[PDB]
Amino acid sequence: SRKRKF
Amino acid sequence: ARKRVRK
Amino acid sequence: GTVNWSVEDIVKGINSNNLESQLQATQAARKLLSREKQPPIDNIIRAGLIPKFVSFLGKTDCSPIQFESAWALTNIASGTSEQTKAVVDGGAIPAFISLLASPHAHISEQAVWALGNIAGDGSAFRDLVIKHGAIDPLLALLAVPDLSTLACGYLRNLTWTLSNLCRNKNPAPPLDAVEQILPTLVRLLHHNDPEVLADSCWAISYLTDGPNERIEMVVKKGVVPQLVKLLGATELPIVTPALRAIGNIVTGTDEQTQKVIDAGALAVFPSLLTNPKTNIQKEATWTMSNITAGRQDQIQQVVNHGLVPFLVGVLSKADFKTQKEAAWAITNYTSGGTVEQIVYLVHCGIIEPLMNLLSAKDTKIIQVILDAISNIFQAAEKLGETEKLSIMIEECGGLDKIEALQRHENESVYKASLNLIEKYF
């Protein structure tokens, strides 16, 4: 959810 | 390097 | 000799009905295309030589002309996408694939190189090389008990071409192709040559940049411990792609992130978060931000490894992009962390640099910082120490920053700043 892909 | 030249 | 030929002489030689004259003309063309400065690629294309080179690729009875034409076409395919497209339009892909099985090692190597260039042009040509059936022979070339019995340059070329077959998105490589390649790529990731290792790590990084199912495909092969080992390497060309792959993996589910943590990756981040290379610091802080977006036990592992002071450090002094990644990490930490963890964060000195960064000319960082402040304030509310934190924010000049932000152009920014000033100040 709060993960941000490259 | 996406492409390389051979010298 | 064969040096400094004119394109007209090369054309006259290739147009002769003499395979040996054609060989000498093709060698002259190769030498022209191997020039360090302004190789006359477009002039060679306009002369219509690519079809003749492609035809020569099939002269099994004259391996020298095969090698020379493969070299010339490789150097043509090394330039613009239009030039690589010219190479592909001449029918070069199937000829090079057929050449992969040549009994002469140098010819097979040149074919590998040419296919690498073509595939590296982009996802369309990559998938076209795959559709022509290059993966099977490419992998058959590496089907040996020990990779150390193969020539160093041969192995490096094969690894780079495979990496290009793993590269690019929109779309990502076909799933079946990735499954076919991964075992050999893992074997290469355990090879002792720094260039093979770097290119294998680059391939893994490409395969892990996407939906979590790709990350799972990669992680199921058990590469995370080796990725962590390489993350600790001394050679920057290896650490860079290893860090990229680890970051990509921690962009996924909590269990994949946990696989990264269990391999001992966090123990390497004291160096990574202080690495003199700005890109390494930036990507390490991005990885840390994605880890602090995980579960509370994972935030606790970040704490136990003594990494919160390092985040405070990069927030205090670093390239602005790294500082933005650090602000993201702090906000994720405060959003997912317990009250005790947020208190620990405050005790490490986060407030002063966090406030100092509110004077930045980037709206997004201001937003992120304000969400972090709101979360820390919520923790304070739970502990009944909101006034203490308000004093800490005032003494370092943060209240001035929020009051100035009240008149910010963005709407969410002034909304949040006003809300803080109304709830706590």
Residue numbers in the entry:
A (entry chain B): 276 to 281
B (entry chain C): 7 to 13
C (entry chain A): 72 to 496
What's the paper's own text on this?
In the best characterized pathway, importin (IMP) α bridges cargoes bearing basic, classical nuclear localization signals (cNLSs) to IMPβ1, which mediates transport through the nuclear pore complex. IMPα recognizes three types of cNLSs via two binding sites: the major binding site accommodates monopartite cNLSs, the minor binding site recognizes atypical cNLSs, while bipartite cNLSs simultaneously interact with both major and minor sites. We combined bioinformatic, biochemical, functional, and structural approaches to study this phenomenon, using polyomaviruses (PyVs) large tumor antigens (LTAs) as a model. We addressed this possibility by x‐ray crystallography, and solved the structures of putative bipartite cNLS peptides of MWPyV, STLPyV, WUPyV, KIPyV, and MCPyV LTAs bound to IMPα2ΔIBB.
However, its sequence (274‐PFSRKRK‐280) does not match the monopartite cNLS consensus (K‐K/R‐X‐K/R), therefore it could represent an atypical NLS interacting with the IMPα major binding site in a non‐canonical fashion. We addressed this issue by solving the crystal structures of IMPα2ΔIBB in complex with FITC‐labeled peptides encompassing MCPyV LTA NLSm (274‐PFSRKRKFGGS‐284) and NLSct (300‐PPKPKKNRE‐308), to resolutions of 2.30 and 2.55 Å, respectively. Our results strikingly revealed that when incubated with IMPα2ΔIBB, MCPyV LTA NLSm could be visualized exclusively within the IMPα2ΔIBB minor binding site. Like in the bipartite structure, the P1′, P2′, P3′, and P4′ sites are occupied by K278, R279, K280, and F281, respectively, and showed almost identical binding patterns. Minor structural differences toward the N‐terminus of the peptide included electron density for residue S276 and loss of the K277 hydrogen bond with IMPα2ΔIBB S406. In MCPyV LTA NLSm, the IMPα2ΔIBB major site is occupied by a bacterial peptide, corresponding to a region of E. coli 30S ribosomal subunit S11 (7‐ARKRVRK‐13, Uniprot: A0A140N7L9) that bound during recombinant protein expression and purification. It is likely that a stronger affinity between IMPα2ΔIBB and the bipartite MCPyV LTA NLS meant that this peptide was ejected out of the major site in the bipartite crystal structure. However, in the absence of NLSct, NLSm is still functional and can directly bind the IMPα minor site with micromolar affinity. Therefore, while full‐length MCPyV LTA can be imported to the nucleus in high levels and via multiple IMPα isoforms using a bipartite cNLS, truncated LTA fragments can still interact with the IMPα minor binding site through NLSm and be actively transported into the nucleus.
